[PDB]
């Protein structure tokens, strides 16, 4: 114990240099030898070795043997520390994963790696199943071979935990990923053949119900028209709309596809013929007729898209409604400690939600007689929502092992996210929740109050509101919020309650669930928090956040309408949490969540480093290439130490929380928001 205290205090006094590292290393090795059954000493030794690797790598970036000398005992101590926890070892597993991915090709680190895979149990990899599959197409032989061996062991022991991302990765466009996934899948048919075929059938069948043929052609033509008439890139629109001709050339298989073929197939063939005539002998005389035909098809498709409001399975996908029993599990619900729920039936009618992306409403029926309602999403990448759900589960586990937050029941409400491809997926449906916009809308429609009364006052005081300077917009915004009593949410939440005790408990839950999500969204960098992205649970009062598409302060650094606020804290959310203000439950809950996130900064740092450094997922944050990821992880490290507002000082938890409160509820920052964000609500 005192050797560990010596190492920690020497690190806290003198930092990390080339003179203190062997001293804290010998202290940590003395502590591990003095105990040999302590998770803390082995963990501190392994993180000290990893920090030595990081420091000696960053020093020669501004030899490969000292890095070896500090990486091999790092992997050894981390694989030793994995087996000591037995309940929660996500950070150690991500550390052995990043060491595996960066230095797993060296022949000496491979020894410790292949010992560690055979040493520890097989369930401890079930938490890092996506992060493994993101590196399945590595161009190095031995690390890729050991990845393939581990994935085959996971598929042999736990076949249900790996079959969905494997069938996701099989239907990719890159060569190495799809052939490695097909290889692991065809090795999976040895012990379980019906499950792989049923899973491929189900995935390939409800990837078609997500985006139909006319929606695919509408999206492709809308992309190619913008590309050709804005960038003059003929070889870009060619690669945009030739896979559509490729998937249309294999024959229609359903009645809807045959209907689309009988309607538009002659025009979509003659346009391809004119495009080929242009591509052989270059002249715009051949491209203008093809684009005329494409615009005719686009204008005929775009008129029948608001009419789509329901889908029958006999017309869209005739293979889904004739299953009647399956070996697949219900997606999003599988744990190795409970009996599995298999997919029994699928409802033969889906309701399409009228929006700009049109999400379907799928509802399966499990083996235990319970209906599982889902949301079949198209035109969206659901690979970010899965990672932020893993982060939210980690944060829930962190808040669960703390005494002062467990007695206050602080947690984030999560939902299942099952991606199916690059542009389609399946979101779990949370019941009893209602949208924040769709609550104020009903309250104003019932109380005879107009919806855009604040916007109408703003446009009446000044017609050119969006073109003013900062001070003029501040004056118009203050005149709008002073001449309007904003108390819709408080009376709306009180009116829908049976008694006062339930109303008080729901208000307490609402405040202490808004504060946790505000601090976690500040640490993560959540943007675009308009009232259509916040939901209230009508039975428990808690707050549910959706649309995790703008993370890591992307919305702060955009060009047209950048937001200057960390989280959403407006006057309607403040007048409905208490009667004095936000200095009660809100500030104390923010202090608790911030100090919990600061005491466990290494775990959330490891999760966010595994998220950002993924080469197939960091394309949304870059609109060398590894410079932006570094300067984002540095910003995240500044947020978790109190060096975010100024680098020459270190702020504690109350000062940082007070600065965030003053920044989020300032009129000069709320006046610059987009009008759809509703800063007056």
């Amino acid at each position: 114990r005192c050797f560990l205290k010596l190492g920690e205090w020497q690190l806290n006094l003198q930092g990390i240099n080339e003179s203190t590292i062997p001293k804290v290393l010998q202290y940590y090795s003395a502590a591990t030898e003095h105990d040999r059954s302590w998770y803390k000493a082995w963990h501190a030794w392994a993180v000290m070795n990893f920090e030595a690797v990081l420091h000696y790598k960053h020093q020669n970036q501004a030899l490969s043997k000292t890095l070896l000398m500090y990486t091999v005992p790092a992997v050894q101590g981390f694989f030793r520390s994995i087996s000591l926890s037995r309940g929660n070892n996500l950070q150690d597993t991500l550390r052995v994963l990043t060491l595996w991915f960066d230095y797993g090709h060296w022949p000496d680190v491979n020894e410790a790696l292949v010992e560690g895979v055979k040493a520890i149990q097989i369930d401890t990899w079930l938490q890092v199943i996506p992060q493994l599959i993101a590196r399945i197409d590595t161009p190095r032989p031995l690390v890729g071979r050991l990845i393939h061996q581990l994935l085959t062991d996971i598929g042999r022991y736990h076949p249900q935990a790996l079959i969905y991302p494997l069938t996701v990765a099989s239907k990719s466009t890159t060569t190495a990923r799809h052939n490695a996934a097909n290889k692991i899948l065809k090795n999976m048919c040895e012990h379980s053949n019906t499950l792989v075929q049923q899973a491929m059938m189900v995935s390939e069948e409800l990837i078609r119900v997500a985006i139909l043929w006319h929606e695919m052609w509408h999206e492709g033509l809308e992309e190619a028209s913008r590309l050709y008439f804005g960038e003059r890139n003929v070889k870009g629109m060619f690669e945009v709309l030739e896979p559509l001709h490729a998937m249309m050339e294999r024959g229609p298989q359903t009645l809807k596809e045959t209907s689309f073929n009988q309607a538009y197939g002659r025009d979509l063939m003659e346009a391809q013929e004119w495009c080929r005539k242009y591509m052989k002998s270059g002249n715009v005389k051949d491209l203008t007729q093809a684009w005329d035909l494409y615009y005719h098809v686009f204008r005929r498709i775009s008129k029948q898209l608001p009419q789509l409001t329901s889908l029958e399975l006999q017309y869209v996908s005739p293979k889904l409604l004739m299953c009647r029993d399956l070996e697949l599990a219900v997606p999003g619900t599988y744990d190795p400690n409970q009996p599995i729920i298999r997919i029994q039936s699928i409802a033969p009618s889906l309701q399409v939600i009228t929006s700009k992306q049109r999400p379907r409403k799928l509802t399966l029926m499990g083996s235990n007689g319970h209906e599982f309602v889902f949301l079949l999403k198209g035109h969206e990448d659901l690979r970010q929502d899965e990672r932020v759900m893993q982060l939210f589960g980690l944060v829930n586990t962190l808040l669960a092992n703390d005494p002062t937050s467990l007695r206050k029941n602080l947690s984030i409400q999560r939902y299942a996210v099952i991606p199916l491809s690059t542009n389609s997926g399946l979101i779990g449906w949370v019941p009893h929740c209602d949208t924040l916009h769709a609550l104020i809308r009903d309250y104003r429609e019932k109380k005879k109050i107009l919806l855009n009364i604040e916007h109408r006052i703003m446009l009446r005081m000044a017609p050119d509101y969006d073109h003013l300077t900062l001070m003029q917009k501040v004056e118009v915004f203050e005149h709008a919020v002073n001449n309007t009593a904003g108390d819709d949410l408080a009376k709306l939440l009180w009116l829908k309650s049976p008694s006062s005790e339930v109303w008080f408990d729901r208000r307490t839950n609402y405040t202490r669930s808004l504060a946790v999500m505000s601090m976690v969204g500040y640490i993560l960098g959540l943007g675009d928090r308009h009232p259509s992205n916040l939901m209230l649970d009508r039975l428990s009062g808690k707050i549910l956040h959706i649309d995790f598409g703008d993370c890591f302060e992307v919305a702060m650094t955009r060009e047209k309408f950048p937001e200057k606020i960390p989280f959403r804290l407006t006057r309607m959310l403040t007048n409905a949490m208490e009667v004095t203000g936000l200095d009660g439950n809100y500030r104390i809950t923010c202090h608790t969540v911030m100090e919990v996130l600061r005491e466990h900064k290494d775990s959330v740092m490891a999760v966010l480093e595994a998220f950002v450094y993924d080469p197939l997922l960091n394309w949304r944050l870059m609109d060398a290439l590894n410079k932006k990821a570094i300067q984002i992880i540095n910003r995240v490290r500044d947020k978790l130490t109190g060096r975010d507002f100024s680098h020459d000082d270190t702020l504690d938890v109350p000062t940082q929380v007070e600065l965030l409160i003053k920044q989020a509820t300032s009129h000069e920052n709320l006046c610059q928001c987009y009008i759809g964000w509703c800063p007056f609500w």
Binding site: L406, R407, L495, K496, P498, S499
Partner: protein, 123 residues
């Protein structure tokens, strides 16, 4: 209990176990529609509000088998409601009919030949 010695022994056992903190007690450990109807959360107009709350009040005594003495008058009151409303008494069917048929199944005696008869009037 009322004996002072028993209460003294009870608080003696309570002290000898000894001062468990409340969170460990709470660790060791539909009916929502009636609460919304007796307070009128849905804000239905008052003319069609008294039948719903009277049906819940009749169903609260018609659910229990311990108080099987006033079953004839709650049944005749239910028939009175269903005849007095008219065509708008269809909304109370999912809450009145399973309890009615369960009571017909579980009861005994010469009230059964009554209940069926009243059930016919419901039909």
């Amino acid at each position: 209990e009322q004996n002072q010695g028993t209460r003294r022994e009870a608080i003696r056992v309570l002290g000898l176990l000894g001062a468990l903190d409340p969170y460990k007690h709470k660790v060791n450990i539909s009916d929502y529609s009636t609460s919304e109807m007796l307070v009128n959360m849905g804000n239905l107009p008052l003319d069609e509000f008294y039948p719903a709350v009277s049906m819940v009040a009749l169903m609260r005594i018609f659910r229990d088998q311990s108080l099987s003495h006033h079953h004839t008058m709650v049944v005749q009151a239910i028939t009175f409601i269903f005849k007095s409303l008219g065509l708008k008494c269809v909304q109370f069917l999912p809450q009145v009919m399973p309890t009615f048929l369960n009571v017909i199944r579980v009861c005994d005696g010469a009230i059964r030949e009554f209940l069926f008869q009243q059930l016919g009037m419901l039909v």
